[PDB]
DNA sequence: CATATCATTTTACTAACTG
DNA sequence: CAGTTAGTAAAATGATATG
């Protein structure tokens, strides 16, 4: 499956890649951790996903989630101050607030 | 579920956001506490909701333990975000010994 | 002894009175508590005076009685709580008279 | 007495105030913690002052008990009030594991 | 006494630094 | 990068102000 995020990125969680519409010939290569976080977020779009859920989907020391979110925001060129993709929900987890569409 | 408050704010408790028709481009970012207070008030529009009911819905139901005064501080922050005058409220009225009351018009979208 | 506060008020702690130069014919009459608070602040100009000192100069050896008297005094001085010109609050330490203070006579 | 910092701010630690010569009418009001940090930094200008020294001067000597994190939060607020860039500081420099350092020019008035 | 606002402290999440 | 240290945002709480 692929996802369209905020009318901008095509995300393929199986190949761990992002493609920016504005730079269609450049493959953005996600680390496995960041790809799995974005996939779980996209599977439950606009839902707040607990740090526990995100954590358990990647690993079996909760600082690793925070760093993986920072890297993902960088690859998405998302602002921490003013997020357009991944929003932090203090004491609750993270929330994918971009428009999310599935293709194929 | 979305709410329209006083014919002015679009409230989304699932995103903790307020959009003011004056500046439809600027999102207003609500903290979870203020959003959950506004949500309970909007679910019971124009009813006086006890401090106890608000404390349980906002904090206890989330597994959070806080003193009573957290509600007062959060009400104060919420009024500031709504630019509601404490002396002459258009949105959130205090009823001493009884709680708080959303007196703005409330409509549900979905 | 009289004090001149911020080039504006003449303060007589002995008669518990304030006179505003902009309204020189009106006597502002202070309650004894507020007058003693102002007097002690004026005796230690621009010093932070502890809540304990202010309280003890007025009342017997609550606490909100000091807070209420400061509020009353700021109203008589037409002082802004948000932007003080006369009596400034020093959180966890007390209050501080920041107006220029002069003794006359 | 007072301090002139970086040829820009007049700092009075007895009044917890900053005056920016660019807006000589606008007093910048410092909290007591931020003012006591700046005061100790200015007493030892361009020296690296340990977190312990700062913690003792700002809180312990005043009779206040706080965690170490209070100093970091207070430094952050102080830099905001000075409009100091954390990435490229003009006023307060962090020296990891050693403390903080006032690198602005410091003069004593009177 | 109850509530409101401001300040301080602490916690939650984020970024920088060094073997 | 790994864990330690520091920075910023948010929450909780304490202090002071008002009704
Ligand atoms: N006492
Ligand atoms: N502080």
């Amino acid at each position: 499956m692929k996802f369209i995020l905020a009318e901008k990125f095509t995300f393929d969680p199986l190949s761990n890649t992002l493609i920016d519409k504005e730079d269609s010939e450049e493959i953005i290569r996600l680390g496995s951790n960041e790809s799995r976080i974005l996939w779980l977020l996209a599977q439950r779009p606009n839902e707040v996903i607990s740090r526990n859920d995100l954590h358990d989907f990647v690993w079996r020391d909760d600082s690793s989630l925070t760093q993986a979110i920072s890297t993902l925001r960088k690859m998405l060129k998302d602002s921490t101050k003013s997020p357009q993709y991944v929003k932090t929900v203090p004491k609750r987890g993270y929330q994918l607030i971009a428009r999310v569409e599935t293709v194929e």
Side-chain angles (χ1 to χ4, degrees), chain A:
Chain A
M1 194 102 93
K2 302 198 208 323
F3 300 87
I4 319 289
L5 308 180
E7 304 305 358
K8 192 157 163 64
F9 297 98
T10 311
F11 170 51
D12 180 345
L14 304 192
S15 73
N16 289 355
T17 64
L18 285 170
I19 301 182
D20 189 342
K21 253 174 199 53
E22 299 316 340
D23 188 29
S24 65
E25 309 310 311
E26 205 98 83
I27 315 178
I28 300 184
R29 284 177 226 261
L30 290 180
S32 180
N33 291 351
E34 289 71 31
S35 183
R36 287 183 71 74
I37 285 136
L38 186 60
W39 184 24
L40 186 64
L41 287 168
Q43 285 174 225
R44 305 182 202 167
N46 207 9
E47 298 179 37
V48 183
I49 315 295
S50 78
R51 312 184 57 85
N52 188 55
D53 284 10
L54 289 160
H55 177 278
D56 294 346
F57 191 71
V58 175
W59 301 285
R60 283 178 118 120
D61 194 73
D62 202 47
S63 150
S64 55
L65 178 53
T66 297
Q67 187 55 60
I69 288 288
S70 186
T71 302
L72 180 61
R73 282 185 173 141
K74 276 164 201 318
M75 314 270 87
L76 292 160
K77 295 126 73 53
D78 206 9
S79 167
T80 305
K81 303 312 207 209
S82 194
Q84 300 240 267
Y85 295 86
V86 178
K87 183 223 280 273
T88 301
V89 195
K91 307 190 70 169
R92 291 169 74 210
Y94 297 92
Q95 187 184 9
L96 181 64
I97 65 159
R99 183 181 162 74
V100 175
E101 311 162 67
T102 55
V103 47
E104 290 169 312

